[PDB]
Write a protein that binds this ligand. Structure first.
Ligand SMILES: [Mg+2]
Ligand SMILES: [Mg+2]
Ligand SMILES: [Mg+2]
Ligand SMILES: [Mg+2]
Ligand SMILES: [Mg+2]
Ligand SMILES: [Mg+2]
Ligand SMILES: [Mg+2]
Ligand SMILES: [Mg+2]
Ligand SMILES: [Mg+2]
Ligand SMILES: [Mg+2]
Ligand SMILES: [Mg+2]
Ligand SMILES: [Mg+2]
Ligand SMILES: [Mg+2]
Ligand SMILES: [Mg+2]
Ligand SMILES: [Mg+2]
Ligand SMILES: [Mg+2]
Ligand SMILES: [Mg+2]
Ligand SMILES: [Mg+2]
Ligand SMILES: [Mg+2]
Ligand SMILES: [Mg+2]
Ligand SMILES: [Mg+2]
Ligand SMILES: [Mg+2]
Ligand SMILES: [Mg+2]
Ligand SMILES: [Mg+2]
Ligand SMILES: [Mg+2]
Ligand SMILES: [Mg+2]
Ligand SMILES: [Mg+2]
Ligand SMILES: [Mg+2]
Ligand SMILES: [Mg+2]
Ligand SMILES: [Mg+2]
Ligand SMILES: [Mg+2]
Ligand SMILES: [Mg+2]
Ligand SMILES: [Mg+2]
Ligand SMILES: [Mg+2]
Ligand SMILES: [Mg+2]
Ligand SMILES: [Mg+2]
Ligand SMILES: [Mg+2]
Ligand SMILES: [Mg+2]
Ligand SMILES: [Mg+2]
Ligand SMILES: [Mg+2]
Ligand SMILES: [Mg+2]
Ligand SMILES: [Mg+2]
Ligand SMILES: [Mg+2]
Ligand SMILES: [Mg+2]
Ligand SMILES: [Mg+2]
Ligand SMILES: [Mg+2]
Ligand SMILES: [Mg+2]
Ligand SMILES: [Mg+2]
Ligand SMILES: [Mg+2]
Ligand SMILES: [Mg+2]
Ligand SMILES: [Mg+2]
Ligand SMILES: [Mg+2]
Ligand SMILES: [Mg+2]
Ligand SMILES: [Mg+2]
Ligand SMILES: [Mg+2]
Ligand SMILES: [Mg+2]
Ligand SMILES: [Mg+2]
Ligand SMILES: [Mg+2]
Ligand SMILES: [Mg+2]
Ligand SMILES: [Mg+2]
Ligand SMILES: [Mg+2]
Ligand SMILES: [Mg+2]
Ligand SMILES: [Mg+2]
Ligand SMILES: [Mg+2]
Ligand SMILES: [Mg+2]
Ligand SMILES: [Mg+2]
Ligand SMILES: [Mg+2]
Ligand SMILES: [Mg+2]
Ligand SMILES: [Mg+2]
Ligand SMILES: [Mg+2]
Ligand SMILES: [Mg+2]
Ligand SMILES: [Mg+2]
Ligand SMILES: [Mg+2]
Ligand SMILES: [Mg+2]
Ligand SMILES: [Mg+2]
Ligand SMILES: [Mg+2]
Ligand SMILES: [Mg+2]
Ligand SMILES: [Mg+2]
Ligand SMILES: [Mg+2]
Ligand SMILES: [Mg+2]
Ligand SMILES: [Mg+2]
Ligand SMILES: [Mg+2]
Ligand SMILES: [Mg+2]
Ligand SMILES: [Mg+2]
Ligand SMILES: [Mg+2]
Ligand SMILES: [Mg+2]
Ligand SMILES: [Mg+2]
Ligand SMILES: [Mg+2]
Ligand SMILES: [Mg+2]
Ligand SMILES: [Mg+2]
Ligand SMILES: [Mg+2]
Ligand SMILES: [Mg+2]
Ligand SMILES: [Mg+2]
Ligand SMILES: [Mg+2]
Ligand SMILES: [Mg+2]
Ligand SMILES: [Mg+2]
Ligand SMILES: [Mg+2]
Ligand SMILES: [Mg+2]
Ligand SMILES: [Mg+2]
Ligand SMILES: [Mg+2]
Ligand SMILES: [Mg+2]
Ligand SMILES: [Mg+2]
Ligand SMILES: [Mg+2]
Lengths: 77, 10, 46
RNA sequence: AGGGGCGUAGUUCAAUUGGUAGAGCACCGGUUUCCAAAACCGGGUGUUGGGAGUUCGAGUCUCUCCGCCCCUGCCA
RNA sequence: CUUUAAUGUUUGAUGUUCUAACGUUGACCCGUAAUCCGGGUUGCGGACAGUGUCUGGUGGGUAGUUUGACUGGGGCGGUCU
RNA sequence: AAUUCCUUGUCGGGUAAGUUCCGACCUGCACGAAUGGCGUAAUGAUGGCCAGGCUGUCUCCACCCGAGACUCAGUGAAAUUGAACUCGCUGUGAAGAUGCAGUGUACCCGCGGCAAGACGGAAAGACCCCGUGAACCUUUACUAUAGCUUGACACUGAACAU
RNA sequence: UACGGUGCUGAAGCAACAAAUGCCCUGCUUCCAGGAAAAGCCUCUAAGCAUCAGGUAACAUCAAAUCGUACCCCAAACCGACACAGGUGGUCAGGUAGAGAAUACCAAGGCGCUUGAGAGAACUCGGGUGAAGGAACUAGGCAAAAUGGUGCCGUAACUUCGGGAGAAGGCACGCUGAUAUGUAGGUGAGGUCCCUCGCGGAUGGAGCUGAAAUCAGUCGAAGAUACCAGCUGGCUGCAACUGUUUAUUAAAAACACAGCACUGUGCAAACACGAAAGUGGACGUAUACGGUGUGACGCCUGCCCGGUGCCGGAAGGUUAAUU
RNA sequence: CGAAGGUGUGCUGUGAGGCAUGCUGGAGGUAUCAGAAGUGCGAAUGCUGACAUAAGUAACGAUAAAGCGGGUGAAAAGCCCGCUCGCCGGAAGACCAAGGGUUCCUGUCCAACGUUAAUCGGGGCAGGGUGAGUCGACCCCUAAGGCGAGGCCGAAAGGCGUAGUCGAUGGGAAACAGGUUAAUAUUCCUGUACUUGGUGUUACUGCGAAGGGGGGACGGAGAAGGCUAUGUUGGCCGGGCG
RNA sequence: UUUUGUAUAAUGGGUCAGCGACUUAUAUUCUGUAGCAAGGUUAACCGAAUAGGGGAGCCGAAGGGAAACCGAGUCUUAACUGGGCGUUAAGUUGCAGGGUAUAGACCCGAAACCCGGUGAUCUAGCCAUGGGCAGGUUGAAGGUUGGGUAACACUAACUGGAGGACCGAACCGACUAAUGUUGAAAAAUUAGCGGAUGACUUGUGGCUGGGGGUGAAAGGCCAAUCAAACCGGGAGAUAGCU
RNA sequence: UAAGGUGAUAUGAACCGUUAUAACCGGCGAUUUCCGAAUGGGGAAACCCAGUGUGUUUCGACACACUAUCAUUAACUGAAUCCAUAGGUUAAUGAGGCGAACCGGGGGAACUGAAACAUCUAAGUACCCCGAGGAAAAGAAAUCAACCGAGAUUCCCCCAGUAGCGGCGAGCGAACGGGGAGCAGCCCAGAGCCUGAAUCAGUGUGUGUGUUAGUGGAAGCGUCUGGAAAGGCGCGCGAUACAGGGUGACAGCCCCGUACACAAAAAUGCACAUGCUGUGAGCUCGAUGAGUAGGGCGGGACACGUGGUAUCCUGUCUGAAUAUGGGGGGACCAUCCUCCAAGGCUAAAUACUCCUGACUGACCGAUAGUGAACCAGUACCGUGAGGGAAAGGCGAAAAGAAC
């Protein structure tokens, strides 16, 4: 499903407004993209379904550090 | 049941 | 004149039988309701 | 019947819409042609349907009255 | 100050060429007894396509509703201070 | 004319007599060319009209054969029903009277029949109207919205040329 | 001997002809719309065994479990609230007449339909017949009556040459005899030849079966005698047609239709169903697919781009998020 | 020594009521003054039950048709037996599938059920009855389709789908005739067969796959030919002399 | 009952018996009553506990002004001789009752909207696999053999067996009329009628689900219900109407 | 515990017991077919079909056991591709489903009200889905206050229908503060010096108190009416027992009980103590949660509907300071107070009752009370989901009527 494997972002629901404030139910989905991340330690490419916000944290945190948290989370990358 | 007898005065 | 009921044991069991009802949760909720109500005959199977 | 529109030169139409009515054709007169026409020059034409009211003043504004158009008169 | 000629800079506008993201409902290999899927090799495309947020346009495709009253029945006509 | 209001348009054919039909006329209220026009053999439980045959369709009904209806025995419903000792007439009267007034008539009670009335029975009227009722449907009614489409940013980088 | 029964005995048990919709036939011929799968079964070798195992063949032998099996099954037992004039798939298919599984009468077999008995009114239902007239009835020939078979003769406008057409209209039909005592035809024994020999071939014609036609005679009012079994013709509107539709008041001129045209769509197709994946389109590729309108065929389809859509253009005007 | 309740009677108050009694019944009832209410019914085409009305009226379910003798019985138009008559006979006969579930057979009974009576019944009651290597099902095999490891996708639920695994209405081994029970039969009995596996013996010996190939394996229409089921006639056998 | 008005021929009721509709909670105002009184009274809670404790708070004794503020005054205005609102007048807490408010709010009754499920054993379409269509006609293409042509073309005869072809049973449809209309039957029967080798018909399974399906298209059909199925829930929806 | 007993309709038959192996009651075990998460495969639930292994032999077979999926962990093997990795095969644990309400979270209406109707209301309600517990959730201040101070969370009464929100309509509706119920605080983001300290979790070991069978339990006679006395009329007695029920009409003394006094082989709850197995207490010095806070855009949650709107959550795009520093104090700034987010844990007061026991009612008394006082979620109806009834009383004793 539409779940970020790093940040855990999932679809959320909200309202479409209007000039008359009419409210209709809608959904907000993450900007998910399948990317092949190069993990140096295994000299391999591992594919992750990440959001655009998740991509930013990967550079800041390091590829190895995030995966360590993922193994603790048991997400089965 | 029934079917409204079309003895209808229009 | 042919009416709405044409008996067919194979069709009846495949449509409303115990295994057909219990295959899905919605049918399993029918069994849960009939168990809660205390029905003598849970499903249509003999 | 009821409601809207219309009546302006000889025929078809502009109108200004309170203070002095034009255009096209037709008609008349004169050119041109052997002659008619086509063409050219010049020009006269109107109670503005009828009446009664307003207004200093009405073809124009108001109301009836004639004539001619256009719409409606539907549900059981 | 104007006119500004040139000067670097900072943003953009196209065009061209790349590959490395991304695409492949191209080929081949393996998982594999498999027209799925995944991985690998390669080719093609390529900073497009596609997707997310925001945003302009369009949208009876689909919804939620409105569409007055008086009236010698109602509608039409007329009327509403 | 599946289209013509006036209208049974007018003329012709068919009939003794034809508001229909057929042929023309054109004055097309308000036909018309793929929301097709005009024709067209065949086809049609297709619509209209005419003729022959044929007949109880009818003039005008008669008889007969069966099944009910009628009588007897057995079994044994239903819709409906305020209560009834439940007549005519004229008038009155939520304005069409078995029930009021006046008057007339009528012994008590079945059975077979006919349906004029009991505003007969059936079903909180379908037409009409109303409610600031419901639902579907239409659109250049209103407000939205899926979808489609546009651009910015992100996924998304490099070099060069202007 | 208990109407049953039980026990014993028990003749002939052949041929010809006719003949299927069954079998050969999952064949043959032909056509376009081009007509499952898998396993059992047969065969082939890999790896893994090739002394073994395993395979083939012949005997002997074991095993073949479990569940259904009554009865109804076009109906009183199923579906219709009913012992309900309804509905319900397959198999079997006797005799006479007949083209026939139509129809009439019968066989095998099964039934008389679970209130009757009287009476013999009106009226109602289902039928029969009808003087005379023959659509005068009625919205309307509604209904009824009538036509009805085979063979032969004959048959118009019109036509897309197929039709129209069974057009219309008419004639002959029984029975008996003769041709010919039981014909033509079909079937076909015995016998006689031939065979590299059999469920054989060629002759051969016995015996069965058997129309159709003609002639002569004969009966009746009537010979397709019953049942069964087209009414016909003329003009015209609409739709070409076969078909489809409002189960339960509308079967039509409505829908569909072949054909025609426009338009979209280059295949990761358009489009559609799906929050998405995917699927259909299509295992198709513009001679294809989707959508729209028209609706065979024949002769044809004129003028308007102002309005509303669609398509193309992009210079300018205006204009969102953003900055 | 007769409470409530019910049913009469009498008295009494302006009224809703009250008091007392005779009978019924057979065990509860309750003054007074306060307190609390599911506190008072004729109607709502009110709800439930009971009972009327029409009314001993309509109807008693295809116009295929009945009649008689005898029997059983308390009782016979309806049951049993017999003889006639009539109806179906491409069905109104026979055998199945689907579906029903004992309605099948026998004994016994007539309250209810049967549109009447009923001795009868598909009614009540009690017994009995369904016998398979070959018929089916199960089993092997697949169609449409369903489910679906992993997988892909999706707020969750879930959706789709691969390998697979299910799913006949189709494809796959084999039995016929005769006899017999009140009710079953290609199942039981008699007679005569056949099939697929297991095991063992003997002889001869290349076997072998989730793999390959063949086969299974397939339309519509039409045309005959050869046949059988079956029928007819003759012959034969038995019986008949009307 | 509803009305200006009903013996009304306007609605309601066949009858009896039973049941059946102004309630409850909280808050607020008013009246009555009781207590205390310029004061009255507690709530939660504690508590052997209907006591007592708890004055947290609430109302009242002072108002005016938008407010700051002032205060028996105050506001307005620059200011009022003014004017508005106030100042002599007992309240408060229980209990009962009359109203109001929020809840279903006196009871019964919608057509509908929304949510989650159940249905394609009927019917519509489609998919897979099987079956059915007596009999009798018409005689296409093609083929053969002639006649004709240089070869065709063409023509004749004979073979052939084409068709949403013809007549007509089964089968399927349902056009007309009669009956039937509390029926034999909640759509049929009888006599006729159309199709009847096909766009046919049928058996057994399967698939498509409710704003959805399916539809040779009628708003038809989707379990006797369809201009939005059925079941349960929101729900005692709402009902200025009866 | 016992002199009676083989459940009920429901008799009968044949028997078993009587002083303790009848029966009955309780604790702990044994057995526990088939279906069902159903788990060897399949399936039209209660049926069909196996595989492996051990052990049996009458050579026909037979009896047990194991064989689902997923998650986690560990071994062994094992591609493209040399290592590897994916994948594959075993073995251990754990999970699957059901169940009333309450709880947290993910989604989320409409009717209705506004006398119409869009914002709003209904309502974060109904419903769907996920997860957990006996409670859950929340919870140890980047909180409030206001220059005085308070000191986690939850719940009740006030504050108050106030301040505010609102087509400023309908309506919605606090907080501060106060009174109560109940109170409890800690750990990591790191290393030493001490040392096993406190405390917690496992378990045994006793005590105490329950729970799951039980034991004893006081005291009346006469007469009258009457079918029968518990009633009438007399005369007694018990009471820590006059709560109730039954007994032929109304029983303190007839029976069962009640008040009191007692009881446990075995299992188990709770609490205290104690022993082991883990568990670390204290001191010093450090460290102080970054794609986070904040911001732009779009929404949502706070009573607060974008409004001048603080605060909280974030789909999107950005992005700090970091104790010499940050957050909040309802736009915003300064000053001043107060606190230290971006890591966690935590009992009590609170909500609910499918179920167990006892007791209570100005609650019902067979059309009432649960739909059901009765073999009721049954009969019956519907393809199905689902809907859903009617029906109690002989008498003291059946003595249920011999003939
Ligand atoms: Mg109308
Ligand atoms: Mg709309
Ligand atoms: Mg609404
Ligand atoms: Mg009005
Ligand atoms: Mg006319
Ligand atoms: Mg004429
Ligand atoms: Mg004409
Ligand atoms: Mg036209
Ligand atoms: Mg045109
Ligand atoms: Mg056109
Ligand atoms: Mg037709
Ligand atoms: Mg005609
Ligand atoms: Mg005639
Ligand atoms: Mg009368
Ligand atoms: Mg009278
Ligand atoms: Mg009168
Ligand atoms: Mg009479
Ligand atoms: Mg009569
Ligand atoms: Mg009459
Ligand atoms: Mg109105
Ligand atoms: Mg039998
Ligand atoms: Mg029948
Ligand atoms: Mg019926
Ligand atoms: Mg029945
Ligand atoms: Mg049939
Ligand atoms: Mg026949
Ligand atoms: Mg008669
Ligand atoms: Mg008649
Ligand atoms: Mg006749
Ligand atoms: Mg006669
Ligand atoms: Mg006559
Ligand atoms: Mg005559
Ligand atoms: Mg006439
Ligand atoms: Mg006449
Ligand atoms: Mg006729
Ligand atoms: Mg006739
Ligand atoms: Mg003709
Ligand atoms: Mg005409
Ligand atoms: Mg047609
Ligand atoms: Mg119809
Ligand atoms: Mg039909
Ligand atoms: Mg019809
Ligand atoms: Mg058309
Ligand atoms: Mg244009
Ligand atoms: Mg243009
Ligand atoms: Mg009482
Ligand atoms: Mg008395
Ligand atoms: Mg008694
Ligand atoms: Mg009451
Ligand atoms: Mg009353
Ligand atoms: Mg009655
Ligand atoms: Mg009688
Ligand atoms: Mg009568
Ligand atoms: Mg009578
Ligand atoms: Mg009668
Ligand atoms: Mg009968
Ligand atoms: Mg007799
Ligand atoms: Mg006969
Ligand atoms: Mg029985
Ligand atoms: Mg019998
Ligand atoms: Mg009797
Ligand atoms: Mg019986
Ligand atoms: Mg056998
Ligand atoms: Mg068996
Ligand atoms: Mg077989
Ligand atoms: Mg899976
Ligand atoms: Mg699937
Ligand atoms: Mg299988
Ligand atoms: Mg089969
Ligand atoms: Mg049998
Ligand atoms: Mg062929
Ligand atoms: Mg033969
Ligand atoms: Mg009346
Ligand atoms: Mg009435
Ligand atoms: Mg008071
Ligand atoms: Mg107190
Ligand atoms: Mg105070
Ligand atoms: Mg003053
Ligand atoms: Mg009050
Ligand atoms: Mg009230
Ligand atoms: Mg045909
Ligand atoms: Mg035909
Ligand atoms: Mg009639
Ligand atoms: Mg025809
Ligand atoms: Mg229907
Ligand atoms: Mg709707
Ligand atoms: Mg409902
Ligand atoms: Mg509600
Ligand atoms: Mg209601
Ligand atoms: Mg199993
Ligand atoms: Mg409203
Ligand atoms: Mg627990
Ligand atoms: Mg004791
Ligand atoms: Mg920190
Ligand atoms: Mg924001
Ligand atoms: Mg503002
Ligand atoms: Mg505002
Ligand atoms: Mg804000
Ligand atoms: Mg941020
Ligand atoms: Mg009673
Ligand atoms: Mg009740
Ligand atoms: Mg009850
Ligand atoms: Mg009762």
């Amino acid at each position: 499903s539409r779940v970020c494997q790093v940040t855990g972002k999932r679809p959320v629901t909200g309202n479409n407004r209007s000039h008359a404030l009419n409210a209709t139910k809608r959904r907000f989905l993450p900007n998910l993209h399948s990317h092949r991340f190069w993990v140096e330690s295994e000299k391999r490419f591992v594919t992750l379904r990440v959001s655009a916000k998740g991509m930013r944290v990967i550079d800041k945190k390091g590829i190895d550090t995030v995966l360590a948290e993922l193994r603790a989370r048991g997400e089965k990358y | 049941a029934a079917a409204a007898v079309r003895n209808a005065r229009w | 004149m042919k009416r709405t009921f044409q008996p067919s044991v194979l069709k009846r069991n495949r449509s409303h039988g115990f295994r057909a009802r219990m295959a899905t949760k919605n049918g399993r909720q029918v069994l849960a309701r009939r168990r809660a109500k205390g029905r003598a005959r849970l499903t249509v199977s003999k």
